[PDB]
PDB file of all heavy atoms in Angstrom:
ATOM      1  N   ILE U 270       5.700 -26.927 -27.997  1.00 58.73           N
ATOM      2  CA  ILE U 270       6.671 -27.568 -28.953  1.00 58.73           C
ATOM      3  C   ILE U 270       8.161 -27.210 -28.630  1.00 58.73           C
ATOM      4  O   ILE U 270       9.055 -27.979 -28.895  1.00 58.73           O
ATOM      5  CB  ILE U 270       6.326 -27.129 -30.338  1.00 58.73           C
ATOM      6  CG1 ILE U 270       4.895 -27.062 -30.628  1.00 58.73           C
ATOM      7  CG2 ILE U 270       6.890 -28.052 -31.516  1.00 58.73           C
ATOM      8  CD1 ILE U 270       4.434 -26.445 -31.922  1.00 58.73           C
ATOM      9  N   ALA U 271       8.432 -26.027 -28.006  1.00 59.94           N
ATOM     10  CA  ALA U 271       9.647 -25.579 -27.686  1.00 59.94           C
ATOM     11  C   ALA U 271      10.009 -25.121 -26.352  1.00 59.94           C
ATOM     12  O   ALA U 271       9.124 -25.189 -25.509  1.00 59.94           O
ATOM     13  CB  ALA U 271      10.070 -24.413 -28.732  1.00 59.94           C
TER      14      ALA U 271
ATOM     15  P     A E 581      14.541 -41.512 -26.551  1.00 36.45           P
ATOM     16  OP1   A E 581      14.358 -42.394 -27.664  1.00 36.45           O
ATOM     17  OP2   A E 581      14.007 -40.142 -26.689  1.00 36.45           O
ATOM     18  O5'   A E 581      14.141 -42.226 -25.197  1.00 36.45           O
ATOM     19  C5'   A E 581      14.301 -43.541 -25.040  1.00 36.45           C
ATOM     20  C4'   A E 581      12.943 -44.235 -25.295  1.00 36.45           C
ATOM     21  O4'   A E 581      12.158 -43.392 -26.110  1.00 36.45           O
ATOM     22  C3'   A E 581      12.992 -45.585 -26.085  1.00 36.45           C
ATOM     23  O3'   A E 581      13.365 -46.713 -25.234  1.00 36.45           O
ATOM     24  C2'   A E 581      11.562 -45.644 -26.670  1.00 36.45           C
ATOM     25  O2'   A E 581      10.635 -46.310 -25.746  1.00 36.45           O
ATOM     26  C1'   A E 581      11.214 -44.157 -26.892  1.00 36.45           C
ATOM     27  N9    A E 581      11.223 -43.723 -28.251  1.00 36.45           N
ATOM     28  C8    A E 581      11.986 -44.099 -29.211  1.00 36.45           C
ATOM     29  N7    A E 581      11.707 -43.476 -30.353  1.00 36.45           N
ATOM     30  C5    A E 581      10.723 -42.688 -29.990  1.00 36.45           C
ATOM     31  C6    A E 581       9.944 -41.688 -30.833  1.00 36.45           C
ATOM     32  N6    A E 581      10.130 -41.398 -32.120  1.00 36.45           N
ATOM     33  N1    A E 581       8.889 -41.080 -30.217  1.00 36.45           N
ATOM     34  C2    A E 581       8.708 -41.397 -28.841  1.00 36.45           C
ATOM     35  N3    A E 581       9.324 -42.155 -28.043  1.00 36.45           N
ATOM     36  C4    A E 581      10.394 -42.809 -28.769  1.00 36.45           C
TER      37        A E 581
ATOM     38  P     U I  20      23.643 -29.712 -44.683  1.00 69.50           P
ATOM     39  OP1   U I  20      24.661 -30.851 -44.598  1.00 69.50           O
ATOM     40  OP2   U I  20      22.405 -29.971 -45.456  1.00 69.50           O
ATOM     41  O5'   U I  20      23.309 -29.225 -43.421  1.00 69.50           O
ATOM     42  C5'   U I  20      24.271 -28.591 -42.586  1.00 69.50           C
ATOM     43  C4'   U I  20      23.712 -27.933 -41.354  1.00 69.50           C
ATOM     44  O4'   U I  20      23.051 -26.698 -41.815  1.00 69.50           O
ATOM     45  C3'   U I  20      22.657 -28.495 -40.573  1.00 69.50           C
ATOM     46  O3'   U I  20      23.085 -29.507 -39.681  1.00 69.50           O
ATOM     47  C2'   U I  20      21.886 -27.484 -39.859  1.00 69.50           C
ATOM     48  O2'   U I  20      22.478 -27.034 -38.748  1.00 69.50           O
ATOM     49  C1'   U I  20      21.916 -26.377 -41.033  1.00 69.50           C
ATOM     50  N1    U I  20      20.706 -26.273 -41.771  1.00 69.50           N
ATOM     51  C2    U I  20      19.582 -25.793 -41.355  1.00 69.50           C
ATOM     52  O2    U I  20      19.462 -25.402 -40.220  1.00 69.50           O
ATOM     53  N3    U I  20      18.469 -25.898 -42.157  1.00 69.50           N
ATOM     54  C4    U I  20      18.452 -26.217 -43.508  1.00 69.50           C
ATOM     55  O4    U I  20      17.396 -26.270 -44.257  1.00 69.50           O
ATOM     56  C5    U I  20      19.719 -26.798 -44.042  1.00 69.50           C
ATOM     57  C6    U I  20      20.779 -26.812 -43.070  1.00 69.50           C
ATOM     58  P     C I  21      22.262 -30.946 -39.438  1.00 68.38           P
ATOM     59  OP1   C I  21      23.187 -31.733 -38.514  1.00 68.38           O
ATOM     60  OP2   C I  21      21.801 -31.499 -40.601  1.00 68.38           O
ATOM     61  O5'   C I  21      21.100 -30.421 -38.526  1.00 68.38           O
ATOM     62  C5'   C I  21      21.365 -29.807 -37.202  1.00 68.38           C
ATOM     63  C4'   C I  21      20.164 -29.167 -36.611  1.00 68.38           C
ATOM     64  O4'   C I  21      19.606 -28.135 -37.454  1.00 68.38           O
ATOM     65  C3'   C I  21      18.843 -30.051 -36.617  1.00 68.38           C
ATOM     66  O3'   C I  21      18.722 -30.851 -35.517  1.00 68.38           O
ATOM     67  C2'   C I  21      17.598 -29.128 -36.563  1.00 68.38           C
ATOM     68  O2'   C I  21      17.521 -28.526 -35.281  1.00 68.38           O
ATOM     69  C1'   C I  21      18.187 -27.956 -37.570  1.00 68.38           C
ATOM     70  N1    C I  21      17.714 -28.180 -38.919  1.00 68.38           N
ATOM     71  C2    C I  21      16.432 -27.970 -39.262  1.00 68.38           C
ATOM     72  O2    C I  21      15.724 -27.499 -38.414  1.00 68.38           O
ATOM     73  N3    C I  21      16.014 -28.143 -40.518  1.00 68.38           N
ATOM     74  C4    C I  21      16.882 -28.604 -41.504  1.00 68.38           C
ATOM     75  N4    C I  21      16.346 -28.706 -42.672  1.00 68.38           N
ATOM     76  C5    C I  21      18.257 -28.885 -41.214  1.00 68.38           C
ATOM     77  C6    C I  21      18.537 -28.691 -39.917  1.00 68.38           C
ATOM     78  P     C I  22      18.015 -32.372 -35.491  1.00 67.84           P
ATOM     79  OP1   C I  22      18.435 -32.971 -34.158  1.00 67.84           O
ATOM     80  OP2   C I  22      18.375 -32.984 -36.728  1.00 67.84           O
ATOM     81  O5'   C I  22      16.537 -31.847 -35.370  1.00 67.84           O
ATOM     82  C5'   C I  22      16.003 -31.167 -34.208  1.00 67.84           C
ATOM     83  C4'   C I  22      14.459 -31.083 -34.394  1.00 67.84           C
ATOM     84  O4'   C I  22      14.327 -30.028 -35.418  1.00 67.84           O
ATOM     85  C3'   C I  22      13.717 -32.230 -34.847  1.00 67.84           C
ATOM     86  O3'   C I  22      13.353 -33.072 -33.759  1.00 67.84           O
ATOM     87  C2'   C I  22      12.545 -31.544 -35.494  1.00 67.84           C
ATOM     88  O2'   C I  22      11.579 -31.043 -34.504  1.00 67.84           O
ATOM     89  C1'   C I  22      13.126 -30.312 -36.083  1.00 67.84           C
ATOM     90  N1    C I  22      13.510 -30.597 -37.548  1.00 67.84           N
ATOM     91  C2    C I  22      12.462 -30.669 -38.544  1.00 67.84           C
ATOM     92  O2    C I  22      11.240 -30.379 -38.194  1.00 67.84           O
ATOM     93  N3    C I  22      12.703 -30.724 -39.900  1.00 67.84           N
ATOM     94  C4    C I  22      14.043 -30.920 -40.217  1.00 67.84           C
ATOM     95  N4    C I  22      14.328 -31.119 -41.464  1.00 67.84           N
ATOM     96  C5    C I  22      15.068 -31.029 -39.241  1.00 67.84           C
ATOM     97  C6    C I  22      14.743 -30.781 -37.950  1.00 67.84           C
ATOM     98  P     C I  23      13.160 -34.626 -34.058  1.00 67.66           P
ATOM     99  OP1   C I  23      13.107 -35.459 -32.824  1.00 67.66           O
ATOM    100  OP2   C I  23      14.319 -35.099 -35.082  1.00 67.66           O
ATOM    101  O5'   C I  23      11.768 -34.813 -34.937  1.00 67.66           O
ATOM    102  C5'   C I  23      10.589 -34.313 -34.308  1.00 67.66           C
ATOM    103  C4'   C I  23       9.500 -34.269 -35.378  1.00 67.66           C
ATOM    104  O4'   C I  23       9.688 -33.283 -36.338  1.00 67.66           O
ATOM    105  C3'   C I  23       9.246 -35.553 -36.148  1.00 67.66           C
ATOM    106  O3'   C I  23       8.625 -36.574 -35.355  1.00 67.66           O
ATOM    107  C2'   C I  23       8.478 -35.145 -37.361  1.00 67.66           C
ATOM    108  O2'   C I  23       7.109 -34.775 -37.002  1.00 67.66           O
ATOM    109  C1'   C I  23       9.116 -33.729 -37.611  1.00 67.66           C
ATOM    110  N1    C I  23      10.316 -33.850 -38.566  1.00 67.66           N
ATOM    111  C2    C I  23       9.925 -33.914 -39.947  1.00 67.66           C
ATOM    112  O2    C I  23       8.688 -33.858 -40.191  1.00 67.66           O
ATOM    113  N3    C I  23      10.829 -34.030 -40.921  1.00 67.66           N
ATOM    114  C4    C I  23      12.184 -34.044 -40.527  1.00 67.66           C
ATOM    115  N4    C I  23      13.073 -34.180 -41.391  1.00 67.66           N
ATOM    116  C5    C I  23      12.517 -34.002 -39.081  1.00 67.66           C
ATOM    117  C6    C I  23      11.591 -33.909 -38.250  1.00 67.66           C
ATOM    118  P     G I  24       8.921 -38.146 -35.598  1.00 67.45           P
ATOM    119  OP1   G I  24       8.314 -39.022 -34.503  1.00 67.45           O
ATOM    120  OP2   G I  24      10.309 -38.188 -35.835  1.00 67.45           O
ATOM    121  O5'   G I  24       8.238 -38.562 -37.009  1.00 67.45           O
ATOM    122  C5'   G I  24       6.827 -38.443 -37.076  1.00 67.45           C
ATOM    123  C4'   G I  24       6.353 -38.664 -38.528  1.00 67.45           C
ATOM    124  O4'   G I  24       6.958 -37.600 -39.306  1.00 67.45           O
ATOM    125  C3'   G I  24       6.850 -39.910 -39.242  1.00 67.45           C
ATOM    126  O3'   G I  24       6.086 -41.068 -38.925  1.00 67.45           O
ATOM    127  C2'   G I  24       6.723 -39.434 -40.709  1.00 67.45           C
ATOM    128  O2'   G I  24       5.353 -39.635 -41.246  1.00 67.45           O
ATOM    129  C1'   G I  24       7.102 -38.000 -40.587  1.00 67.45           C
ATOM    130  N9    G I  24       8.492 -37.804 -40.889  1.00 67.45           N
ATOM    131  C8    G I  24       9.639 -37.539 -40.077  1.00 67.45           C
ATOM    132  N7    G I  24      10.717 -37.397 -40.677  1.00 67.45           N
ATOM    133  C5    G I  24      10.320 -37.491 -41.994  1.00 67.45           C
ATOM    134  C6    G I  24      11.267 -37.484 -43.084  1.00 67.45           C
ATOM    135  O6    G I  24      12.483 -37.369 -43.172  1.00 67.45           O
ATOM    136  N1    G I  24      10.530 -37.868 -44.282  1.00 67.45           N
ATOM    137  C2    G I  24       9.261 -37.973 -44.402  1.00 67.45           C
ATOM    138  N2    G I  24       8.728 -38.176 -45.634  1.00 67.45           N
ATOM    139  N3    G I  24       8.386 -37.963 -43.245  1.00 67.45           N
ATOM    140  C4    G I  24       9.072 -37.914 -42.177  1.00 67.45           C
ATOM    141  P     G I  25       6.964 -42.471 -39.013  1.00 67.09           P
ATOM    142  OP1   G I  25       5.886 -43.554 -38.461  1.00 67.09           O
ATOM    143  OP2   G I  25       8.289 -42.353 -38.461  1.00 67.09           O
ATOM    144  O5'   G I  25       7.091 -42.738 -40.562  1.00 67.09           O
ATOM    145  C5'   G I  25       5.925 -43.113 -41.437  1.00 67.09           C
ATOM    146  C4'   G I  25       6.267 -43.157 -42.795  1.00 67.09           C
ATOM    147  O4'   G I  25       6.906 -42.006 -43.331  1.00 67.09           O
ATOM    148  C3'   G I  25       7.351 -44.435 -43.071  1.00 67.09           C
ATOM    149  O3'   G I  25       6.817 -45.620 -43.231  1.00 67.09           O
ATOM    150  C2'   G I  25       7.925 -43.888 -44.468  1.00 67.09           C
ATOM    151  O2'   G I  25       7.107 -44.181 -45.533  1.00 67.09           O
ATOM    152  C1'   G I  25       7.858 -42.287 -44.301  1.00 67.09           C
ATOM    153  N9    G I  25       9.110 -41.697 -43.824  1.00 67.09           N
ATOM    154  C8    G I  25       9.595 -41.239 -42.652  1.00 67.09           C
ATOM    155  N7    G I  25      10.714 -40.582 -42.605  1.00 67.09           N
ATOM    156  C5    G I  25      11.279 -40.806 -43.890  1.00 67.09           C
ATOM    157  C6    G I  25      12.354 -40.344 -44.504  1.00 67.09           C
ATOM    158  O6    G I  25      13.360 -39.863 -44.005  1.00 67.09           O
ATOM    159  N1    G I  25      12.422 -40.792 -45.846  1.00 67.09           N
ATOM    160  C2    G I  25      11.384 -41.406 -46.580  1.00 67.09           C
ATOM    161  N2    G I  25      11.615 -41.531 -47.830  1.00 67.09           N
ATOM    162  N3    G I  25      10.277 -41.651 -46.085  1.00 67.09           N
ATOM    163  C4    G I  25      10.212 -41.467 -44.696  1.00 67.09           C
ATOM    164  P     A I  46      18.878 -43.453 -38.989  1.00 73.79           P
ATOM    165  OP1   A I  46      18.156 -42.735 -40.107  1.00 73.79           O
ATOM    166  OP2   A I  46      19.683 -44.635 -39.314  1.00 73.79           O
ATOM    167  O5'   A I  46      19.817 -42.301 -38.196  1.00 73.79           O
ATOM    168  C5'   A I  46      20.171 -41.306 -39.021  1.00 73.79           C
ATOM    169  C4'   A I  46      21.618 -40.943 -38.908  1.00 73.79           C
ATOM    170  O4'   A I  46      22.311 -42.307 -38.698  1.00 73.79           O
ATOM    171  C3'   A I  46      22.340 -40.621 -40.188  1.00 73.79           C
ATOM    172  O3'   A I  46      22.220 -39.084 -40.221  1.00 73.79           O
ATOM    173  C2'   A I  46      23.735 -41.023 -39.996  1.00 73.79           C
ATOM    174  O2'   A I  46      24.481 -40.178 -39.202  1.00 73.79           O
ATOM    175  C1'   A I  46      23.556 -42.299 -39.322  1.00 73.79           C
ATOM    176  N9    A I  46      23.401 -43.522 -40.332  1.00 73.79           N
ATOM    177  C8    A I  46      22.432 -44.455 -40.289  1.00 73.79           C
ATOM    178  N7    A I  46      22.530 -45.307 -41.315  1.00 73.79           N
ATOM    179  C5    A I  46      23.713 -45.005 -41.911  1.00 73.79           C
ATOM    180  C6    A I  46      24.419 -45.568 -43.007  1.00 73.79           C
ATOM    181  N6    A I  46      24.052 -46.660 -43.643  1.00 73.79           N
ATOM    182  N1    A I  46      25.584 -44.966 -43.398  1.00 73.79           N
ATOM    183  C2    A I  46      26.051 -43.852 -42.768  1.00 73.79           C
ATOM    184  N3    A I  46      25.506 -43.200 -41.716  1.00 73.79           N
ATOM    185  C4    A I  46      24.388 -43.843 -41.270  1.00 73.79           C
ATOM    186  P     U I  47      21.817 -38.444 -41.626  1.00 71.32           P
ATOM    187  OP1   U I  47      21.915 -37.013 -41.610  1.00 71.32           O
ATOM    188  OP2   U I  47      20.509 -39.020 -41.997  1.00 71.32           O
ATOM    189  O5'   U I  47      22.842 -38.855 -42.745  1.00 71.32           O
ATOM    190  C5'   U I  47      24.138 -38.391 -42.702  1.00 71.32           C
ATOM    191  C4'   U I  47      25.000 -38.943 -43.850  1.00 71.32           C
ATOM    192  O4'   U I  47      25.206 -40.325 -43.815  1.00 71.32           O
ATOM    193  C3'   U I  47      24.386 -38.793 -45.301  1.00 71.32           C
ATOM    194  O3'   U I  47      24.588 -37.492 -45.826  1.00 71.32           O
ATOM    195  C2'   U I  47      25.071 -39.851 -46.073  1.00 71.32           C
ATOM    196  O2'   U I  47      26.414 -39.391 -46.418  1.00 71.32           O
ATOM    197  C1'   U I  47      25.260 -41.018 -45.022  1.00 71.32           C
ATOM    198  N1    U I  47      24.291 -41.979 -45.055  1.00 71.32           N
ATOM    199  C2    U I  47      24.404 -42.893 -46.059  1.00 71.32           C
ATOM    200  O2    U I  47      25.294 -42.958 -46.825  1.00 71.32           O
ATOM    201  N3    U I  47      23.471 -43.864 -46.001  1.00 71.32           N
ATOM    202  C4    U I  47      22.253 -44.041 -45.178  1.00 71.32           C
ATOM    203  O4    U I  47      21.556 -44.962 -45.273  1.00 71.32           O
ATOM    204  C5    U I  47      22.312 -42.977 -44.241  1.00 71.32           C
ATOM    205  C6    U I  47      23.247 -42.036 -44.158  1.00 71.32           C
ATOM    206  P     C I  50      15.517 -36.323 -52.850  1.00 66.22           P
ATOM    207  OP1   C I  50      15.432 -35.625 -54.282  1.00 66.22           O
ATOM    208  OP2   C I  50      16.214 -35.668 -51.783  1.00 66.22           O
ATOM    209  O5'   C I  50      13.991 -36.571 -52.325  1.00 66.22           O
ATOM    210  C5'   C I  50      13.088 -37.314 -53.209  1.00 66.22           C
ATOM    211  C4'   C I  50      11.738 -37.648 -52.554  1.00 66.22           C
ATOM    212  O4'   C I  50      12.043 -38.563 -51.460  1.00 66.22           O
ATOM    213  C3'   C I  50      11.107 -36.434 -51.874  1.00 66.22           C
ATOM    214  O3'   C I  50      10.378 -35.668 -52.795  1.00 66.22           O
ATOM    215  C2'   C I  50      10.273 -37.085 -50.846  1.00 66.22           C
ATOM    216  O2'   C I  50       9.031 -37.635 -51.395  1.00 66.22           O
ATOM    217  C1'   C I  50      11.225 -38.322 -50.360  1.00 66.22           C
ATOM    218  N1    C I  50      12.005 -38.054 -49.171  1.00 66.22           N
ATOM    219  C2    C I  50      11.335 -38.272 -47.886  1.00 66.22           C
ATOM    220  O2    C I  50      10.251 -38.569 -47.907  1.00 66.22           O
ATOM    221  N3    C I  50      12.094 -37.959 -46.783  1.00 66.22           N
ATOM    222  C4    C I  50      13.294 -37.532 -46.755  1.00 66.22           C
ATOM    223  N4    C I  50      13.995 -37.309 -45.722  1.00 66.22           N
ATOM    224  C5    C I  50      13.933 -37.314 -48.040  1.00 66.22           C
ATOM    225  C6    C I  50      13.227 -37.579 -49.241  1.00 66.22           C
ATOM    226  P     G I  51      10.316 -34.091 -52.543  1.00 67.02           P
ATOM    227  OP1   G I  51       9.722 -33.485 -53.664  1.00 67.02           O
ATOM    228  OP2   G I  51      11.702 -33.640 -52.075  1.00 67.02           O
ATOM    229  O5'   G I  51       9.251 -33.895 -51.322  1.00 67.02           O
ATOM    230  C5'   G I  51       7.955 -34.399 -51.397  1.00 67.02           C
ATOM    231  C4'   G I  51       7.127 -34.313 -50.123  1.00 67.02           C
ATOM    232  O4'   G I  51       7.507 -35.308 -49.241  1.00 67.02           O
ATOM    233  C3'   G I  51       7.277 -32.962 -49.334  1.00 67.02           C
ATOM    234  O3'   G I  51       6.471 -31.962 -49.901  1.00 67.02           O
ATOM    235  C2'   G I  51       6.867 -33.442 -48.001  1.00 67.02           C
ATOM    236  O2'   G I  51       5.444 -33.514 -47.889  1.00 67.02           O
ATOM    237  C1'   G I  51       7.466 -34.904 -47.949  1.00 67.02           C
ATOM    238  N9    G I  51       8.786 -34.886 -47.285  1.00 67.02           N
ATOM    239  C8    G I  51       9.956 -34.930 -47.981  1.00 67.02           C
ATOM    240  N7    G I  51      11.059 -34.900 -47.147  1.00 67.02           N
ATOM    241  C5    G I  51      10.361 -34.794 -45.943  1.00 67.02           C
ATOM    242  C6    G I  51      11.038 -34.519 -44.591  1.00 67.02           C
ATOM    243  O6    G I  51      12.211 -34.504 -44.182  1.00 67.02           O
ATOM    244  N1    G I  51       9.965 -34.416 -43.594  1.00 67.02           N
ATOM    245  C2    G I  51       8.634 -34.421 -43.827  1.00 67.02           C
ATOM    246  N2    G I  51       7.814 -34.290 -42.814  1.00 67.02           N
ATOM    247  N3    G I  51       8.088 -34.601 -45.089  1.00 67.02           N
ATOM    248  C4    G I  51       9.013 -34.775 -46.037  1.00 67.02           C
ATOM    249  P     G I  52       6.990 -30.415 -49.576  1.00 66.05           P
ATOM    250  OP1   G I  52       6.200 -29.570 -50.585  1.00 66.05           O
ATOM    251  OP2   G I  52       8.367 -30.430 -49.747  1.00 66.05           O
ATOM    252  O5'   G I  52       6.531 -30.112 -48.132  1.00 66.05           O
ATOM    253  C5'   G I  52       5.196 -30.102 -47.649  1.00 66.05           C
ATOM    254  C4'   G I  52       5.135 -30.246 -46.255  1.00 66.05           C
ATOM    255  O4'   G I  52       5.801 -31.263 -45.642  1.00 66.05           O
ATOM    256  C3'   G I  52       5.828 -28.992 -45.469  1.00 66.05           C
ATOM    257  O3'   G I  52       4.999 -27.806 -45.604  1.00 66.05           O
ATOM    258  C2'   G I  52       5.949 -29.551 -44.025  1.00 66.05           C
ATOM    259  O2'   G I  52       4.694 -29.455 -43.377  1.00 66.05           O
ATOM    260  C1'   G I  52       6.342 -31.035 -44.421  1.00 66.05           C
ATOM    261  N9    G I  52       7.734 -31.122 -44.496  1.00 66.05           N
ATOM    262  C8    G I  52       8.471 -31.365 -45.625  1.00 66.05           C
ATOM    263  N7    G I  52       9.834 -31.462 -45.289  1.00 66.05           N
ATOM    264  C5    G I  52       9.970 -31.284 -43.988  1.00 66.05           C
ATOM    265  C6    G I  52      11.110 -31.250 -43.171  1.00 66.05           C
ATOM    266  O6    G I  52      12.185 -31.433 -43.422  1.00 66.05           O
ATOM    267  N1    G I  52      10.627 -31.110 -41.729  1.00 66.05           N
ATOM    268  C2    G I  52       9.361 -30.976 -41.377  1.00 66.05           C
ATOM    269  N2    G I  52       9.287 -30.642 -39.993  1.00 66.05           N
ATOM    270  N3    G I  52       8.389 -30.934 -42.108  1.00 66.05           N
ATOM    271  C4    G I  52       8.637 -31.160 -43.414  1.00 66.05           C
ATOM    272  P     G I  53       5.642 -26.371 -45.637  1.00 68.22           P
ATOM    273  OP1   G I  53       4.606 -25.318 -45.777  1.00 68.22           O
ATOM    274  OP2   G I  53       6.758 -26.460 -46.503  1.00 68.22           O
ATOM    275  O5'   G I  53       6.282 -26.123 -44.118  1.00 68.22           O
ATOM    276  C5'   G I  53       5.468 -25.977 -43.022  1.00 68.22           C
ATOM    277  C4'   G I  53       6.243 -26.014 -41.712  1.00 68.22           C
ATOM    278  O4'   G I  53       6.991 -27.154 -41.511  1.00 68.22           O
ATOM    279  C3'   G I  53       7.252 -24.777 -41.664  1.00 68.22           C
ATOM    280  O3'   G I  53       6.724 -23.698 -41.398  1.00 68.22           O
ATOM    281  C2'   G I  53       8.268 -25.368 -40.613  1.00 68.22           C
ATOM    282  O2'   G I  53       7.792 -25.171 -39.326  1.00 68.22           O
ATOM    283  C1'   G I  53       8.224 -26.910 -40.956  1.00 68.22           C
ATOM    284  N9    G I  53       9.291 -27.510 -41.750  1.00 68.22           N
ATOM    285  C8    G I  53       9.362 -27.714 -43.072  1.00 68.22           C
ATOM    286  N7    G I  53      10.453 -28.166 -43.591  1.00 68.22           N
ATOM    287  C5    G I  53      11.237 -28.031 -42.482  1.00 68.22           C
ATOM    288  C6    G I  53      12.667 -28.222 -42.349  1.00 68.22           C
ATOM    289  O6    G I  53      13.520 -28.612 -43.169  1.00 68.22           O
ATOM    290  N1    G I  53      13.155 -27.938 -41.016  1.00 68.22           N
ATOM    291  C2    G I  53      12.308 -27.399 -40.034  1.00 68.22           C
ATOM    292  N2    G I  53      12.935 -27.388 -38.840  1.00 68.22           N
ATOM    293  N3    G I  53      11.049 -27.313 -40.132  1.00 68.22           N
ATOM    294  C4    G I  53      10.579 -27.523 -41.384  1.00 68.22           C
ATOM    295  P     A I  54       7.468 -22.264 -41.876  1.00 64.55           P
ATOM    296  OP1   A I  54       6.441 -21.190 -41.768  1.00 64.55           O
ATOM    297  OP2   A I  54       8.063 -22.510 -43.186  1.00 64.55           O
ATOM    298  O5'   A I  54       8.531 -22.005 -40.784  1.00 64.55           O
ATOM    299  C5'   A I  54       8.340 -21.969 -39.530  1.00 64.55           C
ATOM    300  C4'   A I  54       9.574 -22.022 -38.660  1.00 64.55           C
ATOM    301  O4'   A I  54      10.214 -23.237 -38.752  1.00 64.55           O
ATOM    302  C3'   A I  54      10.629 -20.961 -39.023  1.00 64.55           C
ATOM    303  O3'   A I  54      10.363 -19.682 -38.286  1.00 64.55           O
ATOM    304  C2'   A I  54      11.935 -21.556 -38.518  1.00 64.55           C
ATOM    305  O2'   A I  54      12.277 -21.296 -37.212  1.00 64.55           O
ATOM    306  C1'   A I  54      11.600 -23.086 -38.647  1.00 64.55           C
ATOM    307  N9    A I  54      12.119 -23.614 -40.006  1.00 64.55           N
ATOM    308  C8    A I  54      11.435 -23.956 -41.107  1.00 64.55           C
ATOM    309  N7    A I  54      12.195 -24.529 -42.018  1.00 64.55           N
ATOM    310  C5    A I  54      13.467 -24.568 -41.453  1.00 64.55           C
ATOM    311  C6    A I  54      14.747 -24.959 -41.971  1.00 64.55           C
ATOM    312  N6    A I  54      14.735 -25.514 -43.230  1.00 64.55           N
ATOM    313  N1    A I  54      15.789 -24.889 -41.241  1.00 64.55           N
ATOM    314  C2    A I  54      15.696 -24.424 -39.999  1.00 64.55           C
ATOM    315  N3    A I  54      14.513 -23.945 -39.380  1.00 64.55           N
ATOM    316  C4    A I  54      13.515 -24.084 -40.169  1.00 64.55           C
ATOM    317  P     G I  55      10.560 -18.306 -39.107  1.00 61.92           P
ATOM    318  OP1   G I  55       9.835 -17.250 -38.424  1.00 61.92           O
ATOM    319  OP2   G I  55      10.381 -18.643 -40.589  1.00 61.92           O
ATOM    320  O5'   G I  55      12.132 -18.065 -38.974  1.00 61.92           O
ATOM    321  C5'   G I  55      12.728 -18.107 -37.661  1.00 61.92           C
ATOM    322  C4'   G I  55      14.176 -18.191 -37.763  1.00 61.92           C
ATOM    323  O4'   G I  55      14.501 -19.619 -38.155  1.00 61.92           O
ATOM    324  C3'   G I  55      14.894 -17.399 -38.719  1.00 61.92           C
ATOM    325  O3'   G I  55      15.210 -16.092 -38.270  1.00 61.92           O
ATOM    326  C2'   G I  55      16.210 -18.191 -39.080  1.00 61.92           C
ATOM    327  O2'   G I  55      17.161 -18.083 -38.050  1.00 61.92           O
ATOM    328  C1'   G I  55      15.655 -19.682 -38.991  1.00 61.92           C
ATOM    329  N9    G I  55      15.145 -20.231 -40.253  1.00 61.92           N
ATOM    330  C8    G I  55      13.925 -20.109 -40.769  1.00 61.92           C
ATOM    331  N7    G I  55      13.896 -20.779 -41.983  1.00 61.92           N
ATOM    332  C5    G I  55      15.063 -21.172 -42.186  1.00 61.92           C
ATOM    333  C6    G I  55      15.505 -21.956 -43.343  1.00 61.92           C
ATOM    334  O6    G I  55      15.070 -22.435 -44.256  1.00 61.92           O
ATOM    335  N1    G I  55      17.000 -22.216 -43.213  1.00 61.92           N
ATOM    336  C2    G I  55      17.736 -22.027 -42.098  1.00 61.92           C
ATOM    337  N2    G I  55      19.011 -22.411 -42.141  1.00 61.92           N
ATOM    338  N3    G I  55      17.236 -21.303 -41.031  1.00 61.92           N
ATOM    339  C4    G I  55      15.984 -20.914 -41.096  1.00 61.92           C
TER     340        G I  55
END
Side-chain angles (χ1 to χ4, degrees):
Chain U
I270 323 173

